[PDB]
């Protein structure tokens, strides 16, 4: 058993400095988290202003660092010197990043029912993640028979999602996959004619 | 919230493996390559817009190693509990025959940050043009990772992403083939 060799015990330490931003940079919270294996042990929360043990294993560290007044002063000012600074560094290509989805409609290769057409709307390559993907039959929004995969992160600063609709095609109908997204001022639409 | 920037670091023993990366809303801005001692931007344009002094990351990593060893002794060498990954294979766009595409191996919810990923084409390892991300942090302090294989879709080829991890008794084998 075991899918990999070298099964010696492992020991992991993680440090996470989280800058949380509300309403641009009007409200900023710094959360410094120290994690041993899978358990946070001590943290500095800028809303608190000093280190606090999260587990007992972290109590000695909170006590020692809280005795170091230069460190505390630097960490308390980090919401400005660190969080707001780094926010301004990348604001134009992160906060303001907008990438338009590509929208494709096709029948599923799975067609389980005669006189039905299972349609797939693929929405790929977009940023940020907030999106609406909606099916229409003529001018009528379809709410029944819709399944979505939800957001999928691709790892390259784009997302994709898949939304399917079971249809009973009738002559004269047009089915539209319509996408609302911050990258476009008018919705993207792609049509499948019955 | 609207947005979060995370400076995420780790050190792992006995591997002597470190990582330093910046994260914006769950995507990687950059990491520092520990071997080349250089900043690696996740998207090429990022390196035209911004800079980061790699030596700052290396200095923190040395402290992380020291703190790891203190915590290892303080816990009486309590080791990490392996958590095996969840794996999904998908394409970055709808597949058309003979139109270049990319296979994505999506590896999620695992720790420690050590994994082995092999792309197989028709059961044979393939490496041409493959690429991968470093370990991305999760709020539950597990990790996520992406591996990529550019490919030319065809009706004859099949693919598998094979993922191995200390938490897996057997390798995970996730299949993809043309949806004919």
């Amino acid at each position: 058993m075991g899918s990999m060799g070298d099964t010696r015990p492992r020991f992991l330490w993680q440090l996470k400095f989280e800058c949380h931003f509300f309403n641009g940079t009007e409200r900023v919270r710094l959360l410094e988290r120290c994690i041993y294996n899978q358990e946070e042990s001590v943290r500095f929360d800028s809303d608190v202003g000093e280190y606090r043990a999260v587990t007992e294993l972290g109590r000695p560290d909170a006590e020692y660092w809280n005795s170091q007044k230069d460190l505390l002063e630097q960490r308390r000012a980090a919401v400005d010197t660190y969080c707001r600074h780094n926010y301004g560094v990348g604001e134009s290509f992160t906060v303001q990043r907008r990438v338009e989805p590509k929208v494709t409609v096709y029948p599923s290769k799975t067609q389980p029912l005669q006189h039905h057409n299972l349609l797939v709307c693929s929405v790929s390559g977009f940023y940020p993640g907030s999106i609406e993907v909606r099916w229409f039959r003529n001018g009528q929004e379809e709410k029944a028979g819709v399944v979505s995969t939800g957001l999928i992160q691709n790892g390259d600063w784009t997302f994709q999602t898949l939304v399917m609709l079971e249809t009973v095609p009738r002559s004269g109908e047009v089915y539209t996959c319509q996408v609302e997204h911050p990258s476009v001022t008018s919705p993207l639409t792609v049509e499948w004619r019955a | 919230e609207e947005h979060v920037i995370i400076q995420a670091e780790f050190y792992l023993n006995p591997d002597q493996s470190g990582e330093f990366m910046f994260d914006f809303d769950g995507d990687e801005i950059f990491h520092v390559d520990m071997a080349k001692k250089e900043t690696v931007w996740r998207l090429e344009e990022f390196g035209r817009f911004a800079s980061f002094e790699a030596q700052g990351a290396l200095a923190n990593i040395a402290v992380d190693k020291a703190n790891l060893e203190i915590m290892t002794k303080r816990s009486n060498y309590t080791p990490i509990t392996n958590v095996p990954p969840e794996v999904t294979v998908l394409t970055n766009s709808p597949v058309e025959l003979r139109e270049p595409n990319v296979l994505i191996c999506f590896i999620d919810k695992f720790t420690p940050p050590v994994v082995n990923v092999t792309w197989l084409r028709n059961g044979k390892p393939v490496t041409t043009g493959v690429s991968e991300t470093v370990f991305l942090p999760r709020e539950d302090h597990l990790f996520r990772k992406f591996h990529y294989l550019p490919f030319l879709p065809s009706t004859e080829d099949v693919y598998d992403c094979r993922v191995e991890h200390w938490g897996l008794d057997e390798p995970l084998l996730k299949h993809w083939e043309f949806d004919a």
Binding site: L15, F17, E32, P60, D61, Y64, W65, Q68, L71, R75, A78, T81, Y82, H85, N86, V89, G90 | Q7, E9, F20, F22, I29, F30, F49, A50, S51, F52, E53, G56, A57, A59, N60, V63, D64, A66, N67, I70
Partner: peptide, 14 residues
């Protein structure tokens, strides 16, 4: 330069 700043990590009590 347009520079990301890191926060420095500090050791436990020496």
């Amino acid at each position: 330069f347009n520079c990301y700043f890191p926060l420095r990590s500090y050791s436990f009590r020496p």
